[PDB]
Design a protein around this ligand. Structure first.
Ligand SMILES: CC1(C)CCC(CN2CCN(c3ccc(C(=O)NS(=O)(=O)c4ccc(NCC5CCOCC5)c([N+](=O)[O-])c4)c(Oc4cc5ccnc-5n(COP(=O)(O)O)c4)c3)CC2)=C(c2ccc(Cl)cc2)C1
Length: 137
C-alpha cells in the first residue's frame, strides 16, 4: 500500500464531493468511513472549519497542532479516519479562501505524517488490510 496514493485519492474525493476542482477496497473503505465520521461528527466539523485560521505561512503549524492533539492519547482506526477528514477540512478551507496551492502542501504533510508517525502503529495493528477487515465490505 502506498500512503501517497491513499492520501491523493482521499483528498480528490473530499474536494470533488463538495464541488471543488484540483488497493481499491482501501480507498473505498476510507471514503465510507470518512463519510460516516462527517455525518456523526458534524458539530466538530463546523467548529474546526470556522475556527481554523489559515495562511500559506501558518498552515503547517495549524496542521501539526491539530494532529498532535488528535493522536496525543494514542492511535486507533477512528483517529486515523478523523486525521483524513481533518486533512480534507484543511483542503476545502484552503480552496474556499483562494489558497489552493496549499492543497498540494497538505497532501505532502499528510503523506509524511502517515509514513513517519503513523506507519509503526499501522503495521503493528495489522496494516490497511486489518482496517478493511474491521470496517470494509
Ligand atoms: C483533536 C481535535 C483538536 C479535537 C477533537 C476533534 C473531533 N474528534 C471527534 C471524535 N474523534 C474520534 C476519535 C476516536 C474514535 C474511535 O475510537 N473510533 S473507533 O476506532 O472505535 C471506530 C469506530 C467506527 C469506525 N467506522 C464505522 C463506519 C460505519 C459505516 O461504514 C464505515 C465504517 C471506525 N473506522 O475507523 O472506520 C473506527 C471516534 O469514534 C468514531 C470514529 C469513526 C470513524 C468513522 N465513523 C466513526 N464513528 C462513528 O461511529 P459510531 O456510530 O460508533 O459513533 C465514531 C471518534 C476524534 C476527533 C477534532 C477534529 C477532527 C477532525 C475534524 Cl474533520 C474536525 C475536528 C480536532
Amino acid at each position: 500500500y502506498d500512503n501517497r496514493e491513499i492520501v491523493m485519492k482521499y483528498i480528490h474525493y473530499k474536494l470533488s464531493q463538495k464541488g471543488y476542482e484540483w488497493s481499491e477496497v482501501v480507498h473505498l473503505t476510507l471514503r465510507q468511513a470518512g463519510d460516516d465520521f462527517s455525518r456523526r461528527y458534524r458539530r466538530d466539523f463546523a467548529e474546526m472549519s470556522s475556527q481554523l485560521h489559515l495562511t500559506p505561512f501558518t498552515a503547517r503549524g495549524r496542521f501539526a497542532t491539530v494532529v498532535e492533539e488528535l493522536f496525543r492519547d494514542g492511535v486507533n482506526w477512528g483517529r486515523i479516519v478523523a486525521f483524513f477528514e481533518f486533512g480534507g477540512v484543511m483542503c476545502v478551507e484552503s480552496v474556499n479562501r483562494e489558497m489552493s496551492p496549499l492543497v498540494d502542501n497538505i497532501a505532502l504533510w499528510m503523506t509524511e505524517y502517515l509514513n513517519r508517525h503513523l506507519h509503526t502503529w499501522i503495521q503493528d495493528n495489522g496494516g490497511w488490510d486489518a482496517f478493511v477487515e474491521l470496517y470494509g465490505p
